[PDB]
Amino acid sequence: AFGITTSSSAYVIDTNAPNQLKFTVSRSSCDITSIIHYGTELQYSSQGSHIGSGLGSATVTATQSGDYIKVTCVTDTLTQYMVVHNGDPIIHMATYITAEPSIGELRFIARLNSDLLPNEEPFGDVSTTADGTAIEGSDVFLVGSETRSAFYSSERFIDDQRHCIAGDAHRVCMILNQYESSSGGPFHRDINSNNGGSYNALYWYMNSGHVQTESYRMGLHGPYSMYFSRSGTPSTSIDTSFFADLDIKGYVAASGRGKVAGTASGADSSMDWVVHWYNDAAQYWTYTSSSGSFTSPAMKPGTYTMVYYQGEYAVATSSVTVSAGSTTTKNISGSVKTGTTIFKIGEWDGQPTGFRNAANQLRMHPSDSRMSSWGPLTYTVGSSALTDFPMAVFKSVNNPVTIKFTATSAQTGAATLRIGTTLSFAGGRPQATINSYTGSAPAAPTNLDSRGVTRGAYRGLGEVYDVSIPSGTIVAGTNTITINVISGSSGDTYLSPNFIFDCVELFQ
Ligand SMILES: C[C@@H]1O[C@@H](O[C@@H]2[C@H](O)[C@@H](O)[C@@H](O[C@H]3[C@H](O[C@@H]4[C@H](O)[C@@H](O)[C@@H](O[C@H]5[C@H](O[C@@H]6[C@H](O)[C@@H](O)[C@@H](O)O[C@@H]6C(=O)O)O[C@@H](C)[C@H](O)[C@H]5O)O[C@@H]4C(=O)O)O[C@@H](C)[C@H](O)[C@H]3O)O[C@@H]2C(=O)O)[C@H](O)[C@H](O)[C@H]1O
Ligand SMILES: [Ca+2]
């Protein structure tokens, strides 16, 4: 039956789902210590499923409100909520914080039986580190001859409404339709799952210091939903609006929200367009249609910075105010301006898209034998393919990048060499030589104090480095550009100072 079974040490919540879902919540710690789905225990028995590594101690209450059961766990700065609906094999959750946890990240982790749930979806065994030997920190492993990381399960938050772990008789998915309290914007990615040897971990990283570009946000994180299937795959259309009736702290209901609608225009139409709104309280985003039309998700009232991307490259920024119960009509337009192009390597999309190893980097370590050579490589404009240009240059792996290009006598005037990047590590930034002419050393970029390129990430601050080339420095015939990554810092191989490339353009 749908209901709560109480003992001194626990509440057993029964969702009354057709294929059975009961779970045990510790009244002392708020740990999920047992999960029975279709007569089968799914929960790792040594460690609970919980926020972080455990709340440790919490004040726990359970109540029925009609066809809903709510479990509340209170700590000093964090309230954890679990809500179930009669008939549904889902643990709905929401996490209310007034401060960032001590550890400096906010995650939920489900620690589940890896024999029954060995697989990871949608990306496969790339995040299975079981039987792996660490090759970097304690988060990148070698399994046989293949490199592996929990990070290789990651996905841009804008595209991460569902990820799961699974076996032949059970599937457990995270359903994620509310990223408003997270940090890093639409292109932030994070750890999703990890079969690490003892159990298979399923996550939602509400926030983290993994390639973090923003301050943390307080208030209610989620709702998020952990779905339990036999062999089905749950839709991402899961109604959580019943949270409005359960006095969830920090919860703002539909009627407390407003929107922004309009049309974005002017950007590169070969790319997906994204509109992004943020302030200290909340962040929202949406893809636009191919005509540029957009309607924001339901937004908390307030004033927001509004950004228009082609790919992950901001072409315009603006400000907008949202009122509860109304739609603010707000258009946005803009484009990337350069000049008359001599050559262009890659595209202005805020990604290493198309470069050598770009597709692999998301799902493996740069040391992986399946990677193509890092170089040093000479890219000759007109003969070399884009997949011959390294996605990253490391001070101590493939430094420098040499570019060969032909110019006509009509192209010997003043130019700007533009070096567009996505993300830096250890102070990495480019200094350019063109023929016998050396550009200035730019100052160190902001340090994000995080590995990235070795952990499947590329979305950083997107620094752009322009070099003014005087007239008559470019010559008719062959020319040479040397891109050196400079930095006062030092490191072994892929942890040496580096940056990931976005686009390299020479224009007049
Ligand atoms: C090469 C490396 O580079 C630099 O590294 C720093 C930093 O020193 C390093 O720890 C790493 O930090 C990030 C990291 O993020 C990951 C997870 O989000 C985090 O929860 C953690 O996960 C582990 C965790 O285990 C718990 C506990 O830590 C264990 O000791 C044990 O008790 O079990 C606990 C448990 O909950 O089970 O959770 C497990 C489920 C998981 O399996 C564990 O991996 O670590 C992850 C990781 O990537 O290592 O940790 C958080 C707290 C931090 O905020 C992140 O920055 O990466 C940093 C960086 O990239 O800069 C340093 O130079 C370092 O010395 C060097 O070795
Ligand atoms: Ca690019």
For the domain spanning 337-508, the CATH number is: 2.60.120.260
Ligand 1 within 6 A of CB of 138: yes
* Cα 24 to Cα 46: distance, rounded to the nearest angstrom: 14
Handedness of CA 261, 265, 271, 277 (dihedral sign): negative
> Is residue 76 within a helix (H) or strand (E), and if so which, with residue range?
none
Ligand 1 within 6 A of CB of 472: no
> Do 473 and 435 touch, CB atoms closer than 8 A?
yes
> Do 349 and 389 touch, CB atoms closer than 8 A?
no
29, 55, 139: residue to mutate for ligand 1 pocket, most atoms within 8 A of CB = 139
Question: Experimental method for this entry?
Answer: X-ray
Q: Taking the mean position of all CA atoms in its chain, how far away is CA 366?
A: 19
Q: Which residues contact 493 (CB under 8 A, 6 or more apart)?
A: 367, 394, 396, 397
Question: CATH fold of 1-251, please?
Answer: Beta-galactosidase; Chain A, domain 5 (2.70.98)
Ligand nearest to the CA of 193: 1
Query: Which residue is closest in CA terms to ligand 1's atom 67?
Result: 137
Q: Strand, helix or coil at 307?
A: strand
Query: Which residue is closest in CA terms to ligand 1's atom 8?
Result: 137
Ligand 1 within 6 A of CB of 56: no
Secondary structure of 478-502 in the HEC alphabet? EEEEEEEEECCCCCCHHHCCEEEEE
> Do 279 and 302 touch, CB atoms closer than 8 A?
yes
Q: Taking the mean position of all CA atoms in its chain, how far away is CA 66?
A: 37
Residue 290's φ and ψ, nearest 5 degrees, are -65, -20
Domains of the chain: which residue ranges? 1-251, 252-336, 337-508
Q: Which residues contact 32 (CB under 8 A, 6 or more apart)?
A: 23, 24, 25, 26, 43, 48, 49, 50, 91, 110
Query: Which residue is closest in CA terms to ligand 1's atom 31?
Result: 53
* Cα 20 to Cα 16: distance, rounded to the nearest angstrom: 6
Ligand 1 within 6 A of CB of 104: yes
Question: CATH fold of 252-336, please?
Answer: Immunoglobulin-like (2.60.40)
Ligand nearest to the CA of 349: 2
Ligand nearest to the CA of 344: 2
